[PDB]
Design goal:
The structure holds two protein chains of two kinds. Chain A is α+β, with helices and mostly antiparallel strands. Chain A has one domain (1-75): Phosphatidylinositol 3-kinase Catalytic Subunit, Chain A, domain 1 (Ubiquitin-like (UB roll)), CATH 3.10.20. Helix content of chain A is 16%, strand content 31%. Chain A has one helix spanning 23-34; strands at 2-6, 12-16, 41-45, 48-49, 66-71. In chain A, strand 1 (2-6) and strand 2 form a beta hairpin. Chain A starts with a strand and ends with a strand. By secondary structure, chain B is of the alpha+beta class. Chain B has a single domain (1-156), classed as Cathepsin B, Chain A (Alpha-Beta Complex), CATH 3.90.70. Chain B is built from six helices and seven strands. Chain B has a seven-stranded mixed sheet with strand order 1-2-5-4-6-7-3. In chain B, helix 2 (38-47) crosses helix 3 (56-70) and helix 3 (56-70) packs across helix 6 (100-110). The longest helix of chain B has 15 residues, at 56-70. Chain B is globular and about 45 Å long. Classes of the chains: A alpha+beta, B alpha+beta. Chains A and B meet through strand 4 and strand 5 of A and strand 1 of B. Chain A: Residues 1-75 form the Ubiquitin-like domain. Chain A: The modification (Microbial infection) ADP-ribosylthreonine is found at residue 66. Chain A: It is found in: Cytoplasm; Nucleus. Chain A: The modification Phosphoserine is found at residue 65. Chain A: The record marks 68 as: Essential for function.
Chain lengths: 75, 156
């Protein structure tokens, strides 16, 4: 199924996922597609940061839902 | 132009914006030491009078105090995963990197807004509900470094 991700840089991308995909599987797909390393990613939906072990279905994230990506920034 | 910023609330207390501008057109950049404390140096530069290369110790103290009240509830702490005690030991460590985690906690502890401009600007991340004119503005570059920003007088 298709979902959307709005990156930190403001870019809206499409991603092909399954309901049973874990958040980590989804981070990895963002890496494959945009080069953003999974350990910097904070995925947000419905004002909630999503947790690595859980799945899209747990958060009732249905097809065509839009996640927001914010990055952990350090230096 | 600075009034035109479009901030999207993503999660409690945190906003993102994607304006397009030259940092130098609107800000003076106050470079901070290339040690591991640049984040705290930057905060100190913008918050503390008669600031020195040692002033950052105080920001780190406020960060400790902030974590004790906010760390367990901080969404970004989940990427740390550490308990409150192990995180503190590491945070307080010599030359340790600050980050958006500390920024979020400090914003609440100091009662300020902190804006982090990650670079030409790629995006801004705002911690706090204030606007850029009242905010503590930081410049994040190289994915490894923070400097302080001050709005140029003509735009103040």
């Amino acid at each position: 199924m298709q979902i959307f991700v709005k990156t930190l840089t403001g870019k809206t991308i499409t991603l092909e996922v399954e309901p049973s995909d874990t958040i980590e599987n989804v981070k990895a797909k963002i890496q494959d597609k945009e080069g953003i390393p999974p350990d910097q990613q904070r995925l947000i939906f419905a004002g909630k940061q999503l947790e690595d072990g859980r799945t899209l279905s747990d958060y009732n994230i249905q097809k065509e839902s839009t996640l927001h990506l914010v990055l952990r920034l350090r230096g | 132009f600075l009034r035109s910023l479009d901030w999207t609330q993503v999660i409690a207390g945190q906003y993102v914006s994607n304006p397009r501008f030259n940092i130098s057109d609107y800000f003076e950049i106050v470079r901070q030491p290339g040690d591991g404390n640049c984040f705290y140096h930057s905060i100190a530069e913008l918050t503390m009078p008669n600031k020195t290369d040692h002033s950052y110790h105080y920001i780190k103290r406020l960060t400790e105090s902030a974590a004790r009240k906010y760390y367990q509830e901080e969404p970004e702490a989940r990427l740390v995963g550490l308990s409150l005690e192990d995180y503190l030991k590491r945070m307080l460590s010599d030359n340790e990197w600050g980050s958006t985690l500390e920024a979020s906690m400090l914003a609440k502890e100091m009662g300020i807004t902190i804006i982090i401009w990650t670079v030409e600007v790629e995006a801004g991340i705002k911690f706090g509900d204030g606007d850029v004119f009242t905010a503590v503005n930081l410049l994040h570059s190289g994915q490894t470094h923070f400097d302080a920003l001050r709005i140029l007088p003509q735009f103040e």
